[PDB]
Homo-oligomer: A and B are copies of this chain.
Amino acid sequence: HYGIHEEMLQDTVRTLSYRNAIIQNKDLFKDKIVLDVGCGTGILSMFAAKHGAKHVIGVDMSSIIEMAKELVELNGFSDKITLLRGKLEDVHLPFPKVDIIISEWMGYFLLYESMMDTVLYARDHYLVEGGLIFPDKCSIHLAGLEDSQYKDEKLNYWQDVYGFDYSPFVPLVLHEPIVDTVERNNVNTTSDKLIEFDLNTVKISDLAFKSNFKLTAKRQDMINGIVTWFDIVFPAPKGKRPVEFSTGPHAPYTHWKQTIFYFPDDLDAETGDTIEGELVCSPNEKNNRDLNIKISYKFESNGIDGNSRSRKNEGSYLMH
């Protein structure tokens, strides 16, 4: 499992973004108590203590805590960083009132196997009211995707599997969100913002959302589904522009890549054609650590065969 840590540490956009945020707020860190929710190898705890901090408490329920203790001694921070192995709820913090909370909580569709719940638990139970959260703002976005070649190959396969008809797998494949990096040139509609979350104020009840969206076709192509992603923003001192980053196709590689959702219809689009729709995202009733996604869309066109191209449909996707 060191692999997810080599993968997370080698994502320079992620780690440098936390680094640069902590440096921009170094004097806000200066003599404060820091909580690292989901510390991993302790890299963000070592940045906090590196840029001045009275003490950082880093927590995580994984074995890598024992490694991170070795790392925190090797780099001379053993006095300033305490690492606790466990889930935040099961752990007694040595200073119950924390000034800053830093956490790399985000998951694949922002909310997929995210630690957001544990971070809002942390702010609600240990943060000093006007306390700083790193990052504190985020948003989910989408746009139309061209993926004809791959999607037809993925769905054609099940027509004959060694002679047996495997057609019942085709709807199963359409119901599955794919996490993959999309080539920018394949994004073929304008992008829209679904929802936004302010971690200073948001309650867990607001994570189950429902949103409206409209995408306008940028060029003549097929829209086989949507590609979604998220953007991140960090706190900043008065006046300064904040450190931010994006996980979308129009931005550099991030280990979060993008999450693709395939539509049931392959839409035939001309420039200016329009997809208006709605996406709902809710934790599943049977299992809250899985996500029920539903996408409804109205592909309205008009040009010569406009009505023979116009399509309205919906899809339900399950993420797990």
Contact = CB atoms under 8 A, between A and B. Distances in A.
Contact of A2 (B1, B3, B172, B240): B172
Contacts of A240: 163
Interface in A162-183: 162-169, 172-173, 176
B219 A19 contact: no
Interface stretch (A30-38, A83-91, A105-113, A267-275): A267-275
A164 B221 contact: no
A165 B75 contact: yes
Interface string A61-96: 000000100110011000000000000000000000
Given A172-B2, A173-B3, A219-B220, A9 B185 contact: no
A50 B172 contact: no
Given A71-B166, A241-B163, A3 B172 contact: yes
| Oligomer: number of copies | 6
Contacts of A162: 9, 12, 15-16, 19, 43, 47, 160, 163
A252 B41 CA distance: 27
A154 interface: yes
A304 to B, nearest CB: 5
Given A157-B10, A172-B2, A218 B164 contact: no
A206 interface: no
Interface residues of A, number: 63
B271 A219 contact: yes
A163 B46 CA distance: 10
Contacts of A252: 152, 156
Interface of A: 1-3, 5-6, 9-10, 12, 15-16, 19-20, 23, 41, 43, 46-47, 50, 67, 70-71, 74-75, 152, 154, 156-157, 159-169, 172-173, 176, 184-185, 190, 216-222, 240-241, 250, 252, 268, 270-272, 303-305, 320
